[PDB]
Amino acid sequence: SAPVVGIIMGSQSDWETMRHADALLTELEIPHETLIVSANRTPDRLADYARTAAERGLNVIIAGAGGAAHLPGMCAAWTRLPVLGVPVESRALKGMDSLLSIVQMPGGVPVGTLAIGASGAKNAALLAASILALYNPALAARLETWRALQTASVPNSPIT
Amino acid sequence: SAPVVGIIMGSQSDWETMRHADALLTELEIPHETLIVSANRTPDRLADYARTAAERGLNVIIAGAGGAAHLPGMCAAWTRLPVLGVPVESRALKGMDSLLSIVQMPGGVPVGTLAIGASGAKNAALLAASILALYNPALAARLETWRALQTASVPNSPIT
Amino acid sequence: SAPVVGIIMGSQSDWETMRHADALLTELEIPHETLIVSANRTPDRLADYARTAAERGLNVIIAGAGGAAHLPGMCAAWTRLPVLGVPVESRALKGMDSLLSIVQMPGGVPVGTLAIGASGAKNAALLAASILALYNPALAARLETWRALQTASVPNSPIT
Amino acid sequence: SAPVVGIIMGSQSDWETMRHADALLTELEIPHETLIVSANRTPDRLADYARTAAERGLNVIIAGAGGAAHLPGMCAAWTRLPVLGVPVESRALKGMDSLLSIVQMPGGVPVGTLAIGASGAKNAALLAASILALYNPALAARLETWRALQTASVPNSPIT
Amino acid sequence: SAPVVGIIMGSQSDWETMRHADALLTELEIPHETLIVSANRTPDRLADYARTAAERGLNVIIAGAGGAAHLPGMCAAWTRLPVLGVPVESRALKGMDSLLSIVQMPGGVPVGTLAIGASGAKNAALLAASILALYNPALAARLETWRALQTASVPNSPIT
Amino acid sequence: SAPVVGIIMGSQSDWETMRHADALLTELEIPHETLIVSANRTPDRLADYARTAAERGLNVIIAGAGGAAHLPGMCAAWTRLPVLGVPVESRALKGMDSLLSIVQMPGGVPVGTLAIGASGAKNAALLAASILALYNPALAARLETWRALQTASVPNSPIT
Amino acid sequence: SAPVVGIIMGSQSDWETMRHADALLTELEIPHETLIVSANRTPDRLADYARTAAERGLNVIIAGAGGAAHLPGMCAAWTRLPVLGVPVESRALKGMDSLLSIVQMPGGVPVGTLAIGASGAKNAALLAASILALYNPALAARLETWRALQTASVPNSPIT
Amino acid sequence: SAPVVGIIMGSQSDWETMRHADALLTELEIPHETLIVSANRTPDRLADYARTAAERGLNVIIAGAGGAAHLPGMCAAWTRLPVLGVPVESRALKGMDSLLSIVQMPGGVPVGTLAIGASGAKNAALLAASILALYNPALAARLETWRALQTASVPNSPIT
């Protein structure tokens, strides 16, 4: 019941995107916590969260942010845990500012970055699942089943 | 010892970039294999490689490619293992084509994407290490040491 | 009556674009088949389709995909037949991810790429027609008539 | 023997790129002509070239140009033959201007567009070859051999 | 009463943009003609128009086109007259394909290019006016008055 | 003879580009002046230059600048003369910043924009020439000769 | 009561963006003036404003402009005062033309540039406040309180 | 004398760019410190630096970084002082990633952003100087002299 994945996001407005990560973790029965933390506006909240993540038993952090998106990278700055980053789509620049701000991390501080938007959120949860599955046979079985079902459920011909 | 990470790249011309992933894993004493696999030129080789990766004992796959860079996403299409993607800098579009073709994967098929170029390659190895560290206390401590040395070694002022 | 062109697409959502290719082939009386196949989500379905296309009598493949668009390129990986690729417009990046993922193929594995969206679908069908017309006089006549009609039907002055 | 493919390019400065199409066609023993034709500097030369291509026995035209790169689309405007387009890498915008001016052709006037640069040129020749192969069993077998050698020749591991 | 400016455009859909050029010329009492001509779809219509523009008494050509926009550049290919180009905004790429296709002309064949969209159309008409004003004192006076009025009519403080 | 075209540029570093405009005007025997004027570093110099250009007898102004490139638009803000703009290629953004800051002028204040770099500079001179040619039969014939020599001199085939 | 910050903007249409700067200055009790001034369309109005800003007691200028945005840079050309620039979002290019036109100033003429749109306007006011706070203890206290309140008011968990 | 400006940069590789800020401040005799601070590699060093800057007597902070470039925004997150940001030109994306990650800061946390590269660094120092000049008449006069010399020193014509 203790959380092994932490989903953090810069704002309430990010939740429409990051909820897709929450739903997938819940679907695969992965205990997790979901929080709002801003690198730019609550930096000390972020420092506290990220420094203590490992000792709190977290295994993977999923961080979503838009614009000058610094939350995933600064989370990675303070934790040794794998951090996955989700670029939240921005109004003007359609998430390109989000993407480059997250993916272009300097050598030495990784953020595993996923697609702009909801797809990216879903994939960050799936990527966290596959990480956790390495050591968790029951979850690995659940994940296999999920992937196989996705593949089997793709239609064979279009509907007009 | 048997490899627990696979580094695969689209061609020999990717090696100047992907060697940084190789060097990093070796530094942290993570057993790994380093291979050329082309999604487009050797599709069956990729299918076989990715489908059998888990049974062979691999835990993480690091895939690098330039241009349209199908390799990391197609690898992730065939394995349940976490796949990390390194966009290799191409002549014309500077790795922006590679970045988009790797990071914009559909929901259901994650690639954890790192920066364009040598830094991304290094970070892919470090991200793989942080994943393995979750289950390997000795590696986790070596990783902690690596990160501590990085932080401690940054100079306080620039040299002329 | 046997299909000589295969239209494949990553998803039902791609059909609003790819239907324009279907309609044009039907208009020019080119027997064809229309299928949903995903490189990223049904890779084995794609391998089967692409490996057997030639022996099934197909002459040209039209492949439509959006995002990290790998369907046309991976189709080309497994068939010797000409593959034409249609970038499906994406939400955030307006089909630029689709375009670069499709057109920037490595030397040795061509995909003939058309415009983003419906225009591209129409043109992929027309391009397939012109390919088939090389050996098919009746189709060549139909194609000439079609092109000439298009040109004659362009208005000479704007309506307010 | 009489040419069945025309390679045309906007200027001498395109030759460093377009020679790769020339070399490929020669390797596969496809009779062809190689010419400089500028849409903007020699418009009548282009009109004549493209209008008469089919009657002269050409089956496919490969057109390369940089900058605004009007040549491939304007060629396609005047011939019913398949036209394949190679964006040549320009100094300032790295072939992105060429790519867009070639690939974004309106519905009705296809250009099958290949990658920016030397790889695109090579692939334009290979795509032309796969088109001709549909009606020429001996070439089809030579093309099969070429593709098989490409696949078989990719190394298994990188060299240092 | 004979036209001294020719406004040409690729399609009826371009008219919503190019009508702004028509209105401004009419406002400044510059006799002009307004036509639909497509470089890609009516190339022979374009050749005829452009080759004969000068002998028909035209002084300036304003050409509007979107997408793989070749109309202004090909018009310039066939006339010695100044050609001004207006990038029509495109759906997916917001007129960036239009812009680069028009402005990036090779040395030797100028197109004076204006802003994407309606502003560009207005400015192409104003630019044509300033060209014609060089030799036409009455028009020069009308143009001065127009510019001065624009400047005087800019408000001094915002309305809430 | 008194200058009828002014070439102005943002700084000495623009000269490598803008000399091509100078050389072209000289070739066509168009009297002109060539100056450095910075919108941002010498704003009063620009105001004076542009406000007095017409009274001094200038007919066309060619303005080149890199980076934010305020020079051509601000020149057009102060003169009623046609202003032609040359985006100079900057180190970082390759003249894309210059292109946008020149071409996206508001309705009311035209800059006729040419390609990025040396070709744009050449074409700015040629466009200025075609403007002057409307009122100068001897120049019009020299321009016709120039254009005819350009067309006639393009080789028919590439040299190795 | 005398203004110490001047907010200027190119047009009424810019006010929906720049009003956010006005509101924040008023909130922090910073006396200011708010005007419409266009670099491109009222250059002499701008020269007058900018040359006299310092002697009128202004300390900071906030300038908002869209498109070929020259207002902030030309303001900086004529004043020694710090000029902050706000890129107003544009229709086609989503404020990217605005951004590059403002931020890419030549060495020697700074404009401190803020985010595209309303956020940028708010931040230009906050940046001006922090500048003024250096010498104004009461404002510094007000600013601290404002920042602290922002940070304390960020929610801790998302609402569904 | 005690520093009143801090120049901080992400790494030694930024120094080639950021030295231009250092040189400028020295030229204007503005006491300053010049340091390496990495948001991602030395997050605690940055927190300490930025939180204590004001109490240490700093008035302005100039921060430069390349790639994802978290340094300027995270610095601004922890200090109430004005923070000026210099995007450093990166190999792959030419400083466009840095520009977006610096300039697109959320409302509430300003970074005054300057041009990409050496010119931006110079301008960051000049902007800092214009801020300090508001309270320091002797510096204000030195700055006036600097700006006057810049304007007066621009040549009237280019040298060959």
Ligand SMILES: Nc1cncn1[C@@H]1O[C@H](COP(=O)(O)O)[C@@H](O)[C@H]1O
């Ligand atoms: N896209 C792709 C598929 N297989 C290899 N590539 C990429 O093609 C680029 C050029 O490879 P080569 O030098 O062999 O042509 C490399 O970046 C490599 O990843």
Ligand SMILES: Nc1cncn1[C@@H]1O[C@H](COP(=O)(O)O)[C@@H](O)[C@H]1O
């Ligand atoms: N756009 C165009 C029209 N005719 C030739 N070009 C292109 O202009 C570029 C520069 O050619 P040149 O070196 O002759 O100036 C080349 O890439 C060539 O395709």
Ligand SMILES: Nc1cncn1[C@@H]1O[C@H](COP(=O)(O)O)[C@@H](O)[C@H]1O
């Ligand atoms: N934007 C601008 C204003 N005045 C000159 N520039 C431009 O600044 C760039 C660099 O100039 P410099 O080498 O003098 O720093 C040049 O392209 C020049 O047009």
Ligand SMILES: Nc1cncn1[C@@H]1O[C@H](COP(=O)(O)O)[C@@H](O)[C@H]1O
């Ligand atoms: N993003 C970032 C965080 N800390 C330093 N960097 C940046 O990483 C780039 C490469 O630094 P290095 O050469 O040390 O790898 C530099 O531009 C530096 O600002």
